[PDB]
Amino acid sequence: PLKPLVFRPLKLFFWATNRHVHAKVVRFSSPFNEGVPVVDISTFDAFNKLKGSAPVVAPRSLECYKEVAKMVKEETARQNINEVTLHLNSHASDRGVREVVRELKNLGLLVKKV
Amino acid sequence: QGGKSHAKNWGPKFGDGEIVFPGMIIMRQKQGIYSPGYNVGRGRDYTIFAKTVGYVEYSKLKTERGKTRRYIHVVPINDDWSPEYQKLADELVVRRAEVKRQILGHHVHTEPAFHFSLPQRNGNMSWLLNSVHKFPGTTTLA
Amino acid sequence: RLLVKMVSLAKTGYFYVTTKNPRNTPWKLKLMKFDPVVGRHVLFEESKLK
RNA sequence: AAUG
RNA sequence: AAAUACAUAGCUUAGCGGCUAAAGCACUGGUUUCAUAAGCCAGCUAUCAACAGUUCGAGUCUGUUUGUAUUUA
């Protein structure tokens, strides 16, 4: 019962590793050509930012997950992006990824699964 | 003693680069050996049909768990994936019917012409009869 | 298994034909379904198909 | 209440 | 080779999905009799042709290998 594939110009991707969570926004013109990444934010950037001001425990923490969502919201708002579609895979069910997605929805970004 | 079940023609109907129109059947299969790609659909018996005007494509994908997945795609005419392609497809559908009627000839009638009018229900044409037949517009109020 | 008639409770006379097993569900079956005579969903009650 |  | 039935303690004979069991003869012990039979009392036989399946569970339902009738060539 796999559903047919639907092409979308803007998609959100997550890459969950042992140490960090990476979020990217990529624009596509056709499935046969490479995309162009417009946003590239990971918990590594948030950790370097918060640690200077507010001590955090480690990159994989609730404080950094919310910080990553906030930074993603600013970049999309500046570029006039308000709606994205999430790419679902094994990493999409990670607890860290789910926290970031919840924060993005509350901030105002409309994320669609289908 | 003997006997045989009616044959089911499993298999592909089109190859790579062949043009299709909406509603055309591409694959008849008993199990989901092939999966739907872009611009296609799937029936409850794993029949794959086209949903736009374009050309058929085949591709293979390797999944996370090491399995092999096979897709069927329909590519637009000029690789146009913009949302404006839908209206172009609608015009092509109308044009195709006109081409077919011209080739067939006038004596292959495509509409009925009875000595009576078919009833109207819910704003559409219905093939079911009413209890009484009457001429349209031949009566006045009261 | 048996065939039964689900009759509208609006007294419009509309009905549906369904299948029921009297032993597993030994009570009158009731469902919400569309009634074309009225134009909205109403309550239907099981009755003998005869 | 058949038998030895 | 076709076709219809049946293989149940020592022998006839219940049973044909809830556990693996009924009834009569035989056998064993006791009682009655001077003793033996009949008559009386209490017991005992994992009680289910052989193999492979179905099912939570089969003597019980489905196939195969054996034996016995019955009809046909």
Added chain:
RNA sequence: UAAUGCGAUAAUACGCAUGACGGUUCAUUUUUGCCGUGUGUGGUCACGGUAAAACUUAAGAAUCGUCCA
């Protein structure tokens, strides 16, 4: 793809750490056989296929072991 991977509190701040040896799992079409179609007195014929089956020598990658020659 070191913002990696793996872990026996298994969480990831801490532990092992990208080299080197050893053992496993993955080019003149390697060139022979074989198969298919066509033609055929049953083969002194032609073309193609084997990412369907047998068959060669490497080089690399992924684990794993290791005070290291």
Added chain:
RNA sequence: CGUUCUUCAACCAACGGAAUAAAGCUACGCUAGGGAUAACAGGCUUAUUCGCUCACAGAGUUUUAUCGACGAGCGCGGUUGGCACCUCGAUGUUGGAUCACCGCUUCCUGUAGCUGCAAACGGUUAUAAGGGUUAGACUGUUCGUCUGAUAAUGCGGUACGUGAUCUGAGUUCAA
């Protein structure tokens, strides 16, 4: 009383289902057709049957004298089968009487070796088809059992030879 819509039921399981329903005998039989289809004979095939070669294990016990096997190959068209090619505007059945032509895989009358061949009587192999191959009891028989003699009482093919030459006991019409 009639029409439309929403629906269902019975026999249709010989399951495209309808003349509402609905079993047999004919050797007393009749008509129209087929060798498009059987029974006798011919044809094709050779599993089976029969024969030969290899095999020489095993019995005999020095001998492959003689008997004889697992297994494999080849041949024959005579046994039991398979097919449906010829004949249904007709190719007379079994056995015998009468009279025949051919093959040799030889029962007797011949020729030459071997032998567990002293002689006699035998055994086996090779070669040989000119002549011969008996009279009776039982049985419709082919066959089979038996009796008295005989050099010996061979097998097979010929529409399982032979009814425009004979026979009619059996089989196969009406009692």
Added chain:
RNA sequence: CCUAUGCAGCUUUAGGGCAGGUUAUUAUUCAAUAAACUACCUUUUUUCUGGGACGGACGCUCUUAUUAAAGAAACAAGAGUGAGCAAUGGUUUUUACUAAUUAUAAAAAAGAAAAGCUUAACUGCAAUACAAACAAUUAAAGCAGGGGCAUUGUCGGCAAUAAUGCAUUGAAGAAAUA
């Protein structure tokens, strides 16, 4: 011997009838009706088949050989079925799970189980195709109405491949005429 738009005679607890007699019921001073017995009249008693009879079979699915497009026959071979489910249907959430069917290498953004709410197992239509002698049989984007769960996706029954029957005649609910 077999094959017919076959024919005839005979038989019976094969179907239908009453038209003589007997019998039963009723009525008038040699009559009327009949699920009975006898007599009589009329009608029916498939096909396939290595000849016919005897036996077996006739619908619909899966698998095997005739290679790797589809299709393909024999009284060839090996297995199923004439259903079940008021949830085992629809839809959301969670995860130490990834099975089973008559048979089968289906399926990881998918399923199964657990928890919650529900009846789309709808009304009226439908482009275009698969298949196919015809009849029917199969898949389906999309439009309007009323709904379910989500909060903008899906639902016109069930993983898929079997669980069926034309027309006629009869019956039921509603509506329009006369």
Added chain:
RNA sequence: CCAAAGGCAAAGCAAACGGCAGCUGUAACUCUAACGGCUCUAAGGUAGCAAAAUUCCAUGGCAUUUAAAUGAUGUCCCGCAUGAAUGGU
């Protein structure tokens, strides 16, 4: 023997149309079973006769008949599937 399914009749009728079983144990050595046990049915074939105009094994066994007997006669007998007015001897 009138049960079941029919017919007829006065609720009865078989010289009306019809039917008339099976398993198992037992006597000195053996064999056989005079004699027991069980199931079922409306009833379970009695006398007589019997290799038959009736017998599948079959050309049954024995005796007579012939030099020689699938023949004939006599005899033995639960007889595939004999039998008493569709009569038995």
Added chain:
RNA sequence: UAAGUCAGACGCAAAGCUACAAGGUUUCGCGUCAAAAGGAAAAAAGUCCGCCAGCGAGGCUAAGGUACAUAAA
């Protein structure tokens, strides 16, 4: 053409059934016969070469042949 046909046969090459038999039977690919005269192999439906509108005492070839029958070393 709202016509005729719905009895097919064999050769080479595969598979099922039979006995990796049949001039057997059931499917399948090509060809020939059926509806096809002429030439070669003895006669020769299905094999090999090759498709006949008519006449002629011209010529070149295919399959197959080239001491006699019988044309050509």
